[PDB]
Amino acid sequence: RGLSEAKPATPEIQEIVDKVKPQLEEKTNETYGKLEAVQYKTQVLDTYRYILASTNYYIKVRAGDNKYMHLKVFRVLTGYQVDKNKDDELTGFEN
């Protein structure tokens, strides 16, 4: 269950964070206007050869000025860490 290398984020990662934002807000009881999705890492759990599914995303989202969060999305939000800084490496954590 090794983690991928830190890759720059893409529009699909941005849409992933946009679609899991309601779950994040329901879990934190706080509304977020924009999550910029700075970077992301991937974690393969089972086998899907080319690419379709069976993966965990660890996305560093920028919520605001000096306000970053780390999201763990399976697309169901399985985890999150609040109050992270820009240079914090994305690491795996229990859900």
Coordinates of all heavy atoms in Angstrom, one line a residue, unseen atoms left out:
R1 N 0.8 -1.2 0.0 CA 0.0 0.0 0.0 C 0.9 1.3 0.0 O 0.6 2.2 0.8 CB -0.9 0.0 1.2 CG -0.3 -0.3 2.5 CD -1.2 -0.1 3.7 NE -2.5 -0.9 3.6 CZ -3.6 -0.3 3.2 NH1 -3.7 1.0 3.0 NH2 -4.7 -1.1 3.1
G2 N 1.9 1.3 -0.9 CA 2.7 2.4 -1.0 C 2.0 3.6 -1.6 O 1.2 3.5 -2.5
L3 N 2.4 4.8 -1.2 CA 1.9 6.0 -1.8 C 2.6 6.5 -3.0 O 3.8 6.2 -3.2 CB 1.9 7.2 -0.8 CG 0.7 7.4 0.1 CD1 0.9 8.6 1.1 CD2 -0.5 7.7 -0.7
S4 N 1.9 7.2 -3.9 CA 2.5 7.7 -5.1 C 3.3 8.9 -4.8 O 3.3 9.5 -3.7 CB 1.4 8.1 -6.1 OG 0.6 6.9 -6.4
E5 N 4.1 9.4 -5.8 CA 4.9 10.6 -5.6 C 3.9 11.8 -5.7 O 2.9 11.7 -6.4 CB 6.0 10.7 -6.7 CG 7.1 11.7 -6.3 CD 8.2 11.6 -7.3 OE1 8.3 10.6 -8.0 OE2 9.1 12.5 -7.2
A6 N 4.3 12.9 -5.1 CA 3.5 14.1 -5.2 C 3.5 14.7 -6.6 O 4.5 15.0 -7.2 CB 4.1 15.2 -4.2
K7 N 2.2 14.7 -7.1 CA 2.0 15.2 -8.5 C 1.2 16.5 -8.4 O 0.4 16.7 -7.5 CB 1.3 14.2 -9.3 CG 1.8 12.8 -9.3 CD 0.9 11.9 -10.1 CE 0.8 12.2 -11.5 NZ 2.1 12.1 -12.2
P8 N 1.4 17.5 -9.3 CA 0.6 18.7 -9.4 C -0.8 18.3 -9.7 O -1.1 17.3 -10.4 CB 1.2 19.5 -10.5 CG 2.0 18.5 -11.3 CD 2.5 17.5 -10.4
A9 N -1.8 19.1 -9.3 CA -3.2 18.7 -9.4 C -3.7 19.1 -10.8 O -3.2 20.1 -11.4 CB -4.0 19.3 -8.3
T10 N -4.8 18.5 -11.2 CA -5.4 18.6 -12.5 C -6.8 19.0 -12.4 O -7.4 18.9 -11.3 CB -5.2 17.3 -13.3 OG1 -5.8 16.3 -12.6 CG2 -3.7 17.0 -13.5
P11 N -7.5 19.4 -13.5 CA -9.0 19.7 -13.3 C -9.8 18.6 -12.8 O -10.8 18.8 -12.1 CB -9.4 20.1 -14.7 CG -8.1 20.7 -15.3 CD -7.0 19.9 -14.7
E12 N -9.5 17.3 -13.1 CA -10.3 16.2 -12.6 C -10.1 16.1 -11.1 O -11.1 15.8 -10.4 CB -9.9 14.9 -13.3 CG -8.4 14.7 -13.5 CD -7.9 15.2 -14.8 OE1 -8.6 16.1 -15.4 OE2 -6.8 14.8 -15.3
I13 N -8.9 16.3 -10.5 CA -8.7 16.3 -9.1 C -9.5 17.5 -8.5 O -10.2 17.3 -7.4 CB -7.2 16.5 -8.7 CG1 -6.6 15.1 -8.7 CG2 -7.0 17.2 -7.4 CD1 -6.4 14.4 -10.0
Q14 N -9.6 18.6 -9.2 CA -10.4 19.7 -8.7 C -11.9 19.4 -8.6 O -12.5 19.7 -7.7 CB -10.2 20.9 -9.6 CG -10.9 22.2 -9.2 CD -10.7 22.5 -7.8 OE1 -9.6 22.9 -7.4 NE2 -11.8 22.4 -6.9
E15 N -12.4 18.7 -9.7 CA -13.8 18.2 -9.6 C -14.0 17.2 -8.6 O -15.1 17.1 -8.0 CB -14.2 17.7 -11.0 CG -14.0 18.7 -12.1 CD -14.7 20.1 -11.8 OE1 -15.9 20.3 -12.1 OE2 -14.0 21.0 -11.2
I16 N -13.0 16.4 -8.3 CA -13.1 15.4 -7.2 C -13.3 16.1 -5.8 O -14.2 15.8 -5.0 CB -11.9 14.5 -7.1 CG1 -12.0 13.5 -8.3 CG2 -11.9 13.7 -5.8 CD1 -10.8 12.5 -8.3
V17 N -12.5 17.1 -5.6 CA -12.7 17.9 -4.3 C -14.0 18.6 -4.3 O -14.6 18.8 -3.3 CB -11.4 18.8 -4.0 CG1 -10.1 18.1 -4.4 CG2 -11.6 20.1 -4.7
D18 N -14.4 19.1 -5.5 CA -15.7 19.8 -5.6 C -16.9 18.9 -5.3 O -17.9 19.4 -4.7 CB -15.8 20.5 -6.9 CG -14.8 21.7 -7.1 OD1 -14.0 21.8 -6.3 OD2 -15.0 22.4 -8.2
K19 N -16.8 17.7 -5.7 CA -17.9 16.7 -5.5 C -17.9 16.1 -4.1 O -18.9 15.8 -3.6 CB -17.8 15.6 -6.5 CG -18.2 16.0 -7.9 CD -19.6 16.6 -7.9 CE -20.1 16.9 -9.4 NZ -19.3 18.0 -10.0
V20 N -16.7 16.1 -3.4 CA -16.7 15.6 -2.0 C -16.8 16.8 -1.0 O -16.8 16.5 0.2 CB -15.4 14.8 -1.7 CG1 -15.3 13.6 -2.7 CG2 -14.2 15.7 -1.7
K21 N -16.8 18.0 -1.5 CA -16.9 19.1 -0.6 C -18.2 19.1 0.3 O -18.1 19.4 1.5 CB -16.9 20.5 -1.4 CG -17.0 21.7 -0.5 CD -17.2 23.0 -1.3 CE -16.0 23.2 -2.3 NZ -16.3 24.4 -3.2
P22 N -19.4 18.7 -0.2 CA -20.6 18.6 0.7 C -20.4 17.6 1.8 O -20.8 17.9 2.9 CB -21.7 18.1 -0.3 CG -21.0 17.7 -1.5 CD -19.8 18.5 -1.7
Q23 N -19.7 16.5 1.6 CA -19.4 15.5 2.6 C -18.4 16.2 3.7 O -18.6 16.0 4.9 CB -18.8 14.3 2.1 CG -19.5 13.7 0.9 CD -18.8 12.6 0.1 OE1 -18.1 11.8 0.8 NE2 -18.8 12.7 -1.2
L24 N -17.4 16.9 3.2 CA -16.5 17.6 4.1 C -17.2 18.6 5.0 O -17.0 18.7 6.2 CB -15.4 18.2 3.3 CG -14.4 19.1 4.1 CD1 -13.7 18.4 5.2 CD2 -13.4 19.8 3.2
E25 N -18.1 19.4 4.3 CA -18.9 20.4 5.1 C -19.8 19.7 6.1 O -20.0 20.2 7.2 CB -19.7 21.3 4.1 CG -18.8 22.1 3.2 CD -19.6 22.9 2.2 OE1 -20.8 22.6 2.1 OE2 -19.0 23.8 1.6
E26 N -20.5 18.6 5.7 CA -21.4 17.9 6.6 C -20.6 17.3 7.8 O -21.2 17.2 8.9 CB -22.2 16.9 5.9 CG -23.2 16.1 6.7 CD -22.6 14.8 7.3 OE1 -22.0 14.0 6.5 OE2 -22.6 14.6 8.5
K27 N -19.4 16.9 7.6 CA -18.6 16.4 8.6 C -18.0 17.4 9.5 O -17.8 17.2 10.7 CB -17.5 15.5 8.1 CG -17.6 14.0 8.4 CD -18.8 13.3 7.8 CE -18.6 13.2 6.3 NZ -19.8 12.6 5.6
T28 N -17.6 18.6 9.0 CA -17.0 19.7 9.8 C -18.0 20.8 10.2 O -17.6 21.6 11.0 CB -15.8 20.3 9.0 OG1 -16.3 20.9 7.8 CG2 -14.8 19.3 8.7
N29 N -19.2 20.7 9.7 CA -20.2 21.8 10.0 C -19.7 23.2 9.7 O -19.9 24.1 10.5 CB -20.7 21.7 11.5 CG -21.7 20.6 11.7 OD1 -22.4 20.2 10.8 ND2 -21.7 20.0 12.9
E30 N -19.0 23.3 8.6 CA -18.4 24.5 8.1 C -18.5 24.5 6.6 O -18.1 23.6 6.0 CB -17.0 24.8 8.6 CG -16.3 26.0 8.1 CD -14.9 26.1 8.5 OE1 -14.4 25.3 9.3 OE2 -14.2 27.0 8.0
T31 N -18.9 25.7 6.0 CA -19.0 25.8 4.6 C -17.7 26.4 4.0 O -17.1 27.3 4.6 CB -20.2 26.7 4.2 OG1 -20.0 28.0 4.8 CG2 -21.5 26.2 4.7
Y32 N -17.2 25.8 3.0 CA -16.0 26.2 2.3 C -16.3 26.7 0.9 O -16.9 26.0 0.1 CB -15.0 25.0 2.2 CG -14.7 24.3 3.5 CD1 -15.5 23.2 3.9 CD2 -13.8 24.8 4.4 CE1 -15.2 22.5 5.1 CE2 -13.6 24.2 5.6 CZ -14.3 23.0 5.9 OH -14.1 22.4 7.1
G33 N -15.9 27.9 0.6 CA -16.3 28.5 -0.7 C -15.5 28.0 -1.8 O -16.0 27.9 -2.9
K34 N -14.2 27.7 -1.6 CA -13.3 27.2 -2.6 C -12.2 26.4 -2.1 O -11.6 26.8 -1.1 CB -12.7 28.4 -3.4 CG -11.9 28.0 -4.6 CD -12.7 27.1 -5.6 CE -12.0 26.9 -6.9 NZ -10.6 26.3 -6.7
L35 N -12.0 25.2 -2.7 CA -10.8 24.3 -2.3 C -10.0 24.2 -3.6 O -10.4 23.5 -4.5 CB -11.3 23.0 -1.8 CG -12.2 23.1 -0.5 CD1 -12.6 21.7 -0.1 CD2 -11.6 23.9 0.6
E36 N -8.8 24.7 -3.6 CA -8.1 24.9 -4.8 C -7.3 23.6 -5.3 O -6.9 23.6 -6.5 CB -7.1 26.0 -4.7 CG -6.6 26.6 -6.0 CD -5.8 27.9 -5.9 OE1 -5.5 28.3 -4.7 OE2 -5.3 28.4 -6.9
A37 N -7.2 22.6 -4.4 CA -6.5 21.4 -4.8 C -5.1 21.6 -5.4 O -4.9 21.6 -6.6 CB -7.4 20.6 -5.8
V38 N -4.2 21.9 -4.4 CA -2.8 22.2 -4.8 C -2.2 20.9 -5.4 O -1.8 21.0 -6.6 CB -2.0 22.7 -3.6 CG1 -0.6 22.9 -3.9 CG2 -2.6 23.9 -3.0
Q39 N -2.1 19.8 -4.7 CA -1.4 18.6 -5.2 C -2.2 17.4 -4.7 O -3.1 17.5 -4.0 CB 0.0 18.6 -4.7 CG 0.2 18.5 -3.2 CD 1.6 18.4 -2.7 OE1 2.5 18.3 -3.6 NE2 1.9 18.4 -1.4
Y40 N -1.7 16.2 -5.2 CA -2.4 15.0 -4.8 C -1.4 13.8 -5.0 O -0.5 13.9 -5.7 CB -3.6 14.8 -5.7 CG -3.3 14.3 -7.1 CD1 -3.5 13.0 -7.5 CD2 -2.7 15.1 -8.1 CE1 -3.2 12.5 -8.8 CE2 -2.3 14.7 -9.3 CZ -2.6 13.4 -9.7 OH -2.3 12.9 -11.0
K41 N -1.7 12.8 -4.2 CA -1.1 11.5 -4.3 C -2.1 10.4 -4.5 O -3.2 10.5 -4.0 CB -0.2 11.2 -3.1 CG 1.1 12.0 -3.0 CD 1.8 11.7 -1.7 CE 3.1 12.3 -1.5 NZ 3.9 11.8 -0.3
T42 N -1.7 9.3 -5.1 CA -2.7 8.1 -5.3 C -2.2 6.9 -4.6 O -1.0 6.7 -4.4 CB -2.8 7.8 -6.8 OG1 -1.9 6.9 -7.2 CG2 -2.7 9.1 -7.6
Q43 N -3.1 6.0 -4.2 CA -2.8 4.8 -3.5 C -3.7 3.7 -4.2 O -4.9 3.7 -4.0 CB -3.1 4.9 -2.0 CG -2.8 3.6 -1.2 CD -3.2 3.8 0.2 OE1 -4.2 4.5 0.5 NE2 -2.5 3.1 1.1
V44 N -3.1 2.7 -4.8 CA -3.8 1.6 -5.4 C -4.1 0.6 -4.3 O -3.3 0.2 -3.6 CB -3.1 1.0 -6.6 CG1 -3.0 1.9 -7.8 CG2 -1.6 0.6 -6.2
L45 N -5.4 0.2 -4.3 CA -5.8 -0.8 -3.3 C -6.1 -2.2 -3.9 O -5.6 -3.2 -3.4 CB -7.1 -0.4 -2.6 CG -7.1 1.0 -1.9 CD1 -8.4 1.3 -1.2 CD2 -5.9 1.0 -0.8
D46 N -6.8 -2.3 -5.1 CA -6.9 -3.5 -5.8 C -6.5 -3.3 -7.3 O -5.9 -2.3 -7.6 CB -8.4 -4.0 -5.7 CG -8.8 -4.4 -4.3 OD1 -7.9 -5.0 -3.6 OD2 -10.0 -4.2 -3.9
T47 N -6.8 -4.3 -8.1 CA -6.2 -4.3 -9.5 C -7.3 -3.8 -10.5 O -8.4 -4.4 -10.6 CB -5.8 -5.7 -9.8 OG1 -6.9 -6.6 -9.9 CG2 -4.7 -6.2 -8.8
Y48 N -7.0 -2.8 -11.2 CA -7.7 -2.3 -12.4 C -6.7 -1.9 -13.4 O -6.0 -0.9 -13.1 CB -8.7 -1.2 -12.0 CG -10.0 -1.3 -12.8 CD1 -11.2 -1.1 -12.2 CD2 -10.0 -1.5 -14.2 CE1 -12.4 -1.1 -12.9 CE2 -11.2 -1.6 -14.9 CZ -12.4 -1.4 -14.2 OH -13.5 -1.4 -15.0
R49 N -6.6 -2.5 -14.5 CA -5.4 -2.5 -15.3 C -5.0 -1.1 -15.9 O -4.0 -0.6 -15.6 CB -5.4 -3.6 -16.4 CG -4.1 -3.7 -17.2 CD -3.6 -5.2 -17.2 NE -2.9 -5.6 -15.9 CZ -2.2 -6.7 -15.8 NH1 -2.1 -7.5 -16.8 NH2 -1.7 -7.0 -14.6
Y50 N -5.9 -0.6 -16.7 CA -5.5 0.6 -17.4 C -5.7 1.9 -16.5 O -4.8 2.4 -16.0 CB -6.4 0.8 -18.7
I51 N -7.0 2.3 -16.3 CA -7.4 3.0 -15.1 C -8.9 3.1 -15.1 O -9.5 3.5 -16.0 CB -6.8 4.4 -15.1
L52 N -9.6 2.7 -14.0 CA -11.0 3.0 -13.8 C -11.4 3.4 -12.4 O -12.1 4.4 -12.2 CB -11.9 1.9 -14.3
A53 N -10.9 2.7 -11.4 CA -11.4 2.7 -10.0 C -10.4 2.0 -9.1 O -9.3 1.6 -9.5 CB -12.8 2.2 -10.0
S54 N -10.9 1.7 -7.9 CA -10.2 1.0 -6.8 C -8.9 1.8 -6.4 O -7.8 1.3 -6.5 CB -9.8 -0.4 -7.2 OG -8.9 -0.9 -6.3
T55 N -9.1 3.0 -5.9 CA -8.0 3.9 -5.6 C -8.3 4.9 -4.5 O -9.5 5.2 -4.4 CB -7.5 4.6 -6.8 OG1 -6.6 5.7 -6.4 CG2 -8.6 5.2 -7.6
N56 N -7.3 5.3 -3.7 CA -7.5 6.3 -2.8 C -6.7 7.5 -3.2 O -5.6 7.4 -3.7 CB -6.9 5.9 -1.4 CG -8.0 5.2 -0.5 OD1 -9.2 5.4 -0.7 ND2 -7.6 4.5 0.5
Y57 N -7.3 8.7 -3.1 CA -6.7 10.0 -3.4 C -6.4 10.7 -2.1 O -7.2 10.7 -1.2 CB -7.5 10.9 -4.3 CG -7.7 10.3 -5.7 CD1 -8.7 9.5 -6.1 CD2 -6.7 10.7 -6.7 CE1 -8.8 9.0 -7.4 CE2 -6.8 10.2 -8.0 CZ -7.9 9.4 -8.3 OH -8.0 8.9 -9.6
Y58 N -5.2 11.2 -2.0 CA -4.8 12.1 -0.9 C -4.5 13.5 -1.5 O -3.5 13.7 -2.1 CB -3.6 11.6 -0.1 CG -3.9 10.4 0.7 CD1 -3.8 9.1 0.2 CD2 -4.2 10.5 2.0 CE1 -4.1 8.0 0.9 CE2 -4.5 9.4 2.8 CZ -4.4 8.1 2.3 OH -4.7 7.0 3.0
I59 N -5.5 14.4 -1.4 CA -5.5 15.7 -2.0 C -5.2 16.8 -1.0 O -5.9 16.9 0.0 CB -6.8 15.9 -2.8 CG1 -7.1 14.7 -3.7 CG2 -6.7 17.2 -3.6 CD1 -8.6 14.7 -4.1
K60 N -4.2 17.6 -1.3 CA -4.0 18.8 -0.5 C -4.8 19.9 -1.1 O -4.5 20.3 -2.3 CB -2.5 19.2 -0.5 CG -2.2 20.6 -0.1 CD -0.7 21.0 -0.1 CE 0.0 20.4 1.1 NZ 1.5 20.6 1.0
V61 N -5.8 20.4 -0.4 CA -6.6 21.5 -0.9 C -6.3 22.8 -0.1 O -6.0 22.7 1.1 CB -8.1 21.1 -0.7 CG1 -8.5 20.0 -1.6 CG2 -8.4 20.8 0.7
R62 N -6.3 23.9 -0.8 CA -6.1 25.2 -0.2 C -7.5 25.8 0.0 O -8.3 26.0 -0.9 CB -5.3 26.1 -1.1 CG -5.2 27.5 -0.5 CD -4.2 28.4 -1.3 NE -4.0 29.7 -0.7 CZ -4.6 30.8 -1.0 NH1 -5.5 30.7 -1.9 NH2 -4.4 31.9 -0.3
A63 N -7.9 25.9 1.3 CA -9.2 26.5 1.6 C -9.2 28.0 1.7 O -10.2 28.6 1.4 CB -9.7 25.9 3.0
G64 N -8.0 28.6 2.1 CA -7.9 30.0 2.1 C -6.5 30.4 2.4 O -5.6 29.7 2.4
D65 N -6.4 31.7 2.8 CA -5.1 32.3 3.1 C -4.4 31.6 4.3 O -4.9 31.7 5.4 CB -5.2 33.8 3.4 CG -5.7 34.6 2.2 OD1 -5.9 34.0 1.1 OD2 -5.8 35.8 2.3
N66 N -3.3 30.8 4.0 CA -2.6 30.0 5.0 C -3.5 29.0 5.6 O -3.3 28.6 6.7 CB -2.0 30.9 6.0 CG -0.8 31.7 5.5 OD1 0.0 31.1 4.7 ND2 -0.6 32.9 6.0
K67 N -4.6 28.6 4.9 CA -5.5 27.6 5.4 C -5.6 26.4 4.3 O -6.2 26.6 3.3 CB -6.9 28.1 5.6 CG -7.1 28.6 7.1 CD -7.0 30.1 7.2 CE -8.2 30.8 6.7 NZ -9.4 30.6 7.6
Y68 N -5.0 25.3 4.6 CA -4.9 24.1 3.8 C -5.5 22.9 4.6 O -5.4 22.9 5.8 CB -3.5 23.8 3.4 CG -2.8 24.7 2.5 CD1 -2.2 25.9 3.0 CD2 -2.8 24.6 1.1 CE1 -1.5 26.8 2.2 CE2 -2.2 25.5 0.3 CZ -1.5 26.6 0.8 OH -0.9 27.5 0.0
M69 N -6.0 22.0 3.8 CA -6.6 20.7 4.4 C -6.1 19.6 3.5 O -5.8 19.7 2.4 CB -8.1 20.7 4.4 CG -8.7 22.0 4.9 SD -10.5 21.9 4.8 CE -10.9 20.7 6.0
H70 N -6.0 18.4 4.2 CA -5.6 17.2 3.5 C -6.8 16.2 3.4 O -7.3 15.8 4.5 CB -4.4 16.5 4.1 CG -3.1 17.1 3.8 ND1 -1.9 16.6 4.3 CD2 -2.8 18.2 3.1 CE1 -0.9 17.4 3.8 NE2 -1.5 18.3 3.1
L71 N -7.3 15.9 2.2 CA -8.5 15.1 2.0 C -8.1 13.7 1.6 O -7.2 13.5 0.8 CB -9.4 15.7 1.0 CG -10.5 16.7 1.4 CD1 -10.0 17.6 2.6 CD2 -10.9 17.6 0.2
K72 N -8.7 12.7 2.2 CA -8.6 11.3 1.8 C -9.9 10.8 1.2 O -10.8 10.6 2.0 CB -8.1 10.4 3.0 CG -8.0 8.9 2.6 CD -7.7 8.1 3.9 CE -7.8 6.6 3.6 NZ -7.6 5.8 4.8
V73 N -10.0 10.6 -0.1 CA -11.2 10.3 -0.8 C -11.0 8.9 -1.4 O -10.0 8.7 -2.1 CB -11.5 11.4 -1.9 CG1 -12.6 10.9 -2.8 CG2 -11.9 12.7 -1.2
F74 N -12.0 8.1 -1.3 CA -12.1 6.8 -1.9 C -12.8 6.8 -3.2 O -12.3 6.8 -4.3 CB -12.6 5.7 -1.0 CG -12.7 4.3 -1.6 CD1 -11.6 3.5 -1.6 CD2 -13.9 3.9 -2.1 CE1 -11.7 2.3 -2.1 CE2 -13.9 2.6 -2.7 CZ -12.8 1.8 -2.7
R75 N -17.2 8.3 -5.0 CA -16.1 9.0 -4.4 C -16.5 9.5 -3.0 O -17.0 10.6 -2.8 CB -15.6 10.2 -5.2
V76 N -16.2 8.7 -2.0 CA -16.7 8.9 -0.6 C -15.5 9.4 0.3 O -14.5 8.7 0.3 CB -17.3 7.7 0.0 CG1 -16.6 6.4 -0.5 CG2 -17.3 7.7 1.5
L77 N -15.7 10.6 0.9 CA -14.6 11.1 1.7 C -14.4 10.3 3.0 O -15.2 10.2 3.9 CB -15.0 12.6 2.2 CG -14.0 13.3 3.1 CD1 -12.8 13.7 2.3 CD2 -14.6 14.4 3.8
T78 N -13.3 9.5 3.0 CA -13.0 8.7 4.1 C -12.1 9.3 5.2 O -12.1 8.9 6.3 CB -12.3 7.4 3.6 OG1 -11.0 7.7 3.1 CG2 -13.1 6.7 2.6
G79 N -11.4 10.4 4.9 CA -10.7 11.1 5.9 C -10.3 12.5 5.6 O -10.5 13.0 4.5
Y80 N -9.9 13.2 6.6 CA -9.5 14.6 6.4 C -8.6 15.1 7.6 O -8.9 14.7 8.8 CB -10.6 15.6 6.2 CG -11.6 15.7 7.4 CD1 -11.5 16.7 8.3 CD2 -12.6 14.7 7.5 CE1 -12.4 16.8 9.4 CE2 -13.5 14.8 8.6 CZ -13.4 15.8 9.5 OH -14.3 15.9 10.6
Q81 N -7.6 15.9 7.3 CA -6.9 16.6 8.3 C -7.0 18.1 8.1 O -6.7 18.6 7.0 CB -5.4 16.1 8.3 CG -5.2 14.7 8.7 CD -3.7 14.2 8.4 OE1 -3.1 14.6 7.5 NE2 -3.2 13.5 9.4
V82 N -7.3 18.8 9.1 CA -7.5 20.3 9.0 C -6.3 20.9 9.6 O -5.4 20.3 10.2 CB -8.8 20.7 9.8 CG1 -9.2 22.1 9.4 CG2 -9.9 19.7 9.7
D83 N -6.1 22.2 9.2 CA -5.0 23.1 9.7 C -3.7 22.5 9.3 O -2.9 22.1 10.2 CB -5.1 23.3 11.2 CG -6.4 24.0 11.6 OD1 -7.2 24.5 10.8 OD2 -6.7 24.0 12.8
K84 N -3.4 22.4 8.0 CA -2.1 22.0 7.5 C -1.5 23.2 6.8 O -2.2 24.1 6.4 CB -2.2 20.8 6.5 CG -3.1 19.7 7.1 CD -2.4 18.3 7.0 CE -1.2 18.3 7.9 NZ -0.5 17.0 7.9
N85 N -0.2 23.2 6.7 CA 0.6 24.2 6.0 C 0.9 23.8 4.6 O 0.8 22.7 4.2 CB 1.8 24.6 6.8 CG 2.6 23.5 7.4 OD1 2.3 23.0 8.5 ND2 3.5 23.0 6.6
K86 N 1.3 24.8 3.8 CA 1.5 24.6 2.4 C 2.6 23.5 2.1 O 2.4 22.7 1.2 CB 2.0 25.9 1.7 CG 2.3 25.8 0.3 CD 2.7 27.2 -0.3 CE 4.0 27.6 0.4 NZ 4.4 29.0 -0.1
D87 N 3.6 23.5 2.9 CA 4.8 22.6 2.7 C 4.6 21.2 3.3 O 5.5 20.3 3.1 CB 6.1 23.2 3.2 CG 6.3 24.5 2.5 OD1 5.8 24.8 1.4 OD2 7.1 25.3 3.1
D88 N 3.5 20.9 4.0 CA 3.2 19.6 4.6 C 3.1 18.6 3.5 O 2.3 18.7 2.6 CB 2.0 19.7 5.4 CG 2.2 20.2 6.8 OD1 3.4 20.3 7.2 OD2 1.3 20.5 7.6
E89 N 3.9 17.5 3.6 CA 3.8 16.4 2.7 C 2.5 15.6 2.9 O 2.1 15.5 4.0 CB 5.0 15.5 2.8 CG 6.3 16.0 2.2 CD 6.9 17.1 3.0 OE1 6.6 17.2 4.2 OE2 7.7 17.9 2.4
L90 N 1.9 15.2 1.8 CA 0.8 14.3 1.9 C 1.2 12.9 2.4 O 2.0 12.3 1.7 CB 0.1 14.2 0.5 CG -0.7 15.5 0.1 CD1 -1.0 15.5 -1.4 CD2 -2.0 15.7 0.9
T91 N 0.6 12.5 3.5 CA 0.9 11.2 4.0 C -0.4 10.4 4.3 O -1.5 11.0 4.5 CB 1.7 11.3 5.3 OG1 1.9 10.0 5.9 CG2 0.9 12.1 6.3
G92 N -0.3 9.1 4.3 CA -1.5 8.3 4.6 C -1.8 8.3 6.0 O -1.0 8.4 6.9
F93 N -3.1 8.2 6.3 CA -3.6 8.1 7.7 C -4.9 7.3 7.8 O -5.6 7.2 6.8 CB -3.8 9.6 8.2 CG -4.6 10.4 7.3 CD1 -6.0 10.4 7.3 CD2 -4.0 11.3 6.4 CE1 -6.8 11.2 6.5 CE2 -4.7 12.1 5.5 CZ -6.1 12.0 5.6
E94 N -5.1 6.8 9.0 CA -6.3 5.9 9.2 C -7.6 6.8 9.0 O -7.6 8.0 9.1 CB -6.3 5.3 10.6
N95 N -8.7 6.1 8.7 CA -9.9 6.8 8.5 C -10.9 6.5 9.6 O -11.7 7.4 10.0 CB -10.6 6.3 7.2 CG -10.6 4.8 7.1 OD1 -10.4 4.0 8.0 ND2 -10.9 4.3 5.8

